[PDB]
Amino acid sequence: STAILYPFTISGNDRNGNFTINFKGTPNSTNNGCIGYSYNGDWEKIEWEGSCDGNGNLVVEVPMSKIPAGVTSGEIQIWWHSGDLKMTDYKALEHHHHHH
Numbered sequence: 001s002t003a004i005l006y007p008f009t010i011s012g013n014d015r016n017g018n019f020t021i022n023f024k025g026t027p028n029s030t031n032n033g034c035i036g037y038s039y040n041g042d043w044e045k046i047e048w049e050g051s052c053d054g055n056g057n058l059v060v061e062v063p064m065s066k067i068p069a070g071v072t073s074g075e076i077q078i079w080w081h082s083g084d085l086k087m088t089d090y091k092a093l094e095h096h097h098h099h100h
């Protein structure tokens with residue numbers, strides 16, 4: 001695996017709001033990745049991209065509606081990172097997650 005990996009599980013049913021992810025990295029870096037998940041024996045990916053601001057921060061927002069009903073697990077992945085990048089937190093549905 002060449003990706004930096006962050007597993008998650010979700011409700012199979014609730015699709016309100018956003019899946020919001022906080023990344024911390026090199027200021028002004030450029031970055032991309034996905035929210036990946038298994039759906040009926042396929043690995044599906046919702047791509048994200050963005051740059052860190054001058055504080056090293058990048059907030060990604062993906063509508064929950066992009067994940068099919070019935071999906072209950074997946075992985076946030078970092079693909080390209082021009083400098084350093086890590087996920088610190090995500091919020092999806094009622095789950096407020098901090099990555100120690």
Ligand SMILES: C[As](C)(=O)[O-]
Nearest residue numbers: 095096097098099
């Ligand atoms: C509420 As937790 C253990 O996912 O940061």
